[PDB]
């Protein structure tokens, strides 16, 4: 897949992704906060189409992510991120994608997610998150 | 003066300021590093013009500021920052302005300056710095 | 169980835990680094005994934990931490315990674990980790 690294920011304002229940997560793009202003991150797109679009608009700064969880598994022989769920201090967004495969979860007790990096080919191959006070 | 606050970034690539030998520091602007790419900061301008511009171009990432110093004093009834000197691990830039008044110095042993805030009216009134690892 | 919170230190020098191959993790204790000298953490003990002790001595400061993984699951009607594995930049320590139930894993790309908190009854009920640069 094509690797990407948005880097670190002041917080998160909105997440735009797409998914296909038959397969895995597809596109991934984030609107961050950069010292008070919306920073439109680059859209990291899947090489193929057919996905269902999702837009997660957070009530920043009152609302913020408290836990990120999901599933990783095989699709056409490749290990990819098949599902994602985003929980905030206000609501739960997801799951997007079928909840089958190997689970993972990152609950945050103190601190904030301030950036994302990863790789996307036909599907989201893998991803990492920047954390800060 | 008009208060300003750039916020925090990844590092510093360039500082563009102005000063006048007859008075003190005037305009102040910073070109920050934001996740490996340049980010052009807002230019914070004096209420008046006639200053001499100076560009401090740092060899980022190997060059960084280790100490900031200067002098505060009275200019036409205003207590302002009359002079600034920036010392990096490679060399010294300044003093720019008038070196008389009460001195102040911020030596950094570990860590980096990643942002500036303050107030500028006819001259640079005061300023603070964001520090981070 | 009984809650515990060691707080944050400057690193990890040794982990002393105990477990049982048929049940789950029992005692948990950490020898932290505090400003370049060892700091002996409180020993958090199970309400029972009969566990197998393990000593994980790290080659501090060059050796450090890069991933904590394990399994949570039911034991006598309640969820507990059944297994733990600690992977460093040099070696793998574990799995210790019973590798069944729901997996979890916390890989670290940049930064360090500098403290632990959680709760221990008959077994380790749950735990959280302090992360810092």
């Amino acid at each position: 897949g094509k690797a990407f690294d948005d880097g670190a920011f002041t917080g998160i304002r909105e997440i735009n992704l797409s998914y296909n229940k038959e397969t895995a997560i597809g596109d991934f793009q984030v609107v961050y906060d950069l010292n008070g202003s919306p920073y439109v991150g680059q859209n990291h797109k899947s090489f193929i189409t057919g996905f269902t679009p999702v837009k997660i608009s957070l009530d920043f700064p009152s609302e913020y992510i408290m836990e990120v969880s999901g599933y990783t598994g095989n699709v056409s022989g490749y290990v990819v991120v098949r599902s994602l769920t985003f929980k905030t201090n206000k609501k739960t967004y997801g799951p997007y994608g079928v909840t089958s495969g190997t689970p993972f979860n990152l609950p945050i007790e103190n601190g904030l997610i301030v950036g994302f990096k990863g790789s996307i080919g036909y599907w989201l191959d893998y991803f990492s998150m920047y954390l800060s006070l | 003066g008009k208060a300003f606050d750039d916020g925090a970034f990844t590092g510093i690539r360039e500082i563009n300021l102005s000063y006048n030998k007859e008075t003190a520091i005037g305009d102040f602007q910073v070109v920050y590093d934001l996740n490996g790419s340049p980010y052009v900061g807002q230019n914070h301008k004096s209420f008046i013009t006639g200053f001499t511009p100076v560009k401090i171009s740092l060899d980022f990432p190997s060059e960084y500021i280790m100490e900031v110093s200067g002098y505060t004093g009275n200019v036409s009834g205003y207590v302002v920052v009359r002079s600034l000197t920036f010392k990096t691990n490679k060399k010294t830039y300044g003093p720019y302005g008038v070196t008389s008044g009460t001195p102040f110095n911020l030596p950094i042993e570990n860590g980096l300056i990643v942002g500036f805030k303050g107030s500028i009216g006819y001259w640079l009134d005061y300023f603070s710095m964001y520090l981070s690892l | 169980g009984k809650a515990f919170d060691d707080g944050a230190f400057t690193g990890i020098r040794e982990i002393n835990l105990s477990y049982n191959k048929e049940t789950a993790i029992g005692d948990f204790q950490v020898v932290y680094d505090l400003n370049g000298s060892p700091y002996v953490g409180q020993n958090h003990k199970s309400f029972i005994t009969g566990f197998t002790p393990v000593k994980i001595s790290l080659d501090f400061p060059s050796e450090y934990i890069m991933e904590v993984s394990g399994y949570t699951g039911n034991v006598s009607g309640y969820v507990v931490v059944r297994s733990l594995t600690f992977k460093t930049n040099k070696k793998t320590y574990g799995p210790y315990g019973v590798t069944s139930g729901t997996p979890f894993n916390l890989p670290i790309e940049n930064g360090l674990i500098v403290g632990f908190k959680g709760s221990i009854g008959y077994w380790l009920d749950y735990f959280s980790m302090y992360l810092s640069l």
Partner: peptide
């Protein structure tokens, strides 16, 4: 160096 650092956890997914 002159680059600010941040804690990063992951990756989850393929190696």
């Amino acid at each position: 160096s002159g680059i600010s650092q941040t804690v990063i956890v992951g990756p989850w997914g393929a190696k």
